[PDB]
Amino acid sequence: FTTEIHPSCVTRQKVIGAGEFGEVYKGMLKTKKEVPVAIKTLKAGYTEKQRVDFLGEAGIMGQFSHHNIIRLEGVISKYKPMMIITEYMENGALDKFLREKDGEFSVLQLVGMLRGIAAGMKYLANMNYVHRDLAARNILVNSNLVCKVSDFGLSIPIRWTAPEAISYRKFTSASDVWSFGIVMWEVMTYGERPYWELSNHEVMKAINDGFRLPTPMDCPSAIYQLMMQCWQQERARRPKFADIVSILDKLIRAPDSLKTLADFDPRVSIRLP
Numbered sequence: 001f002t003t004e005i006h007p008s009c010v011t012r013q014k015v016i017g018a019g020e021f022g023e024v025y026k027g028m029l030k031t032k033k034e035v036p037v038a039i040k041t042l043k044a045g046y047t048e049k050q051r052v053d054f055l056g057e058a059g060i061m062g063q064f065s066h067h068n069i070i071r072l073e074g075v076i077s078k079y080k081p082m083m084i085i086t087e088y089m090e091n092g093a094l095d096k097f098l099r100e101k102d103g104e105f106s107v108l109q110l111v112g113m114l115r116g117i118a119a120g121m122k123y124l125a126n127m128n129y130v131h132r133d134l135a136a137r138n139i140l141v142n143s144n145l146v147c148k149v150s151d152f153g154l155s156i157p158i159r160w161t162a163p164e165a166i167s168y169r170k171f172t173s174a175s176d177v178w179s180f181g182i183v184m185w186e187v188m189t190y191g192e193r194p195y196w197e198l199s200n201h202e203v204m205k206a207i208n209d210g211f212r213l214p215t216p217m218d219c220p221s222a223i224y225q226l227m228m229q230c231w232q233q234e235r236a237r238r239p240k241f242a243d244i245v246s247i248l249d250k251l252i253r254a255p256d257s258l259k260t261l262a263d264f265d266p267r268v269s270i271r272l273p
């Protein structure tokens, strides 16, 4: 089912990711000139469960075909080490990207990133795939600024996780919507750490007591309203991803709607005579 690629078509050029069981490489793929790819390996000695999880991720990604979901090129399973080969996202993980490009984008660009992520999540949820770990660190960015959801499989990141998922392990597309709200806040803040220095227990306590992340600086009122509704305690009151995509598409198509900003509560006062 998945395209099987011969090892002689794959050149690993540089490590770009953390590797217990293997590494993630930037490389080139023969398929016409070579195309850049990302390459994930599974080193000899892997267990049965590691093999199932590894090839499981490629199995899941091969079932998807969407602009905002990482595209699978193929696998090496007949030879060792085994490999998963995907498109190469030139700008890396979204969280690191925003932190290293602080203030460099327009509000419309930032909201377009969110629309892309939302479109990918709507596709995943409609396909009956619950991500469970939606966060900017799991979004990849290419040279067109397109954001793609990544990190698939099954087998807790507290400050991204909905209360019902923390409290009793109920992970659904509605808990992914909560996470998407955190991702909205990450994007509009250029990669700020959610809840800043609060401990995990302090975050859970604050959420359970009704507190929510404050408005980012320079944040459209419509965008803050939307992320606040992603954070409703009652799951059934959260927007569906179809609602999120619709709202973001309308804001982008009428971009003056983004010029109305939510008030920012300053932590500091500077007074000048």
Ligand SMILES: Cc1cccc(Cl)c1NC(=O)c1cnc(Nc2cccc(C(=O)NC3CCNCC3)c2)s1
Binding pocket: 016, 017, 024, 038, 039, 040, 057, 070, 084, 085, 086, 087, 088, 089, 090, 091, 092, 093, 140, 150, 151
């Ligand atoms: C290969 C694979 C197997 C299973 C699942 C997935 Cl999602 C993938 N694909 C990937 O992990 C990746 C696809 N594209 C990736 N691009 C990526 C990731 C991390 C860093 C960079 C990267 O080049 N980052 C910096 C860019 C600017 N400064 C220099 C380096 C690129 S990783």
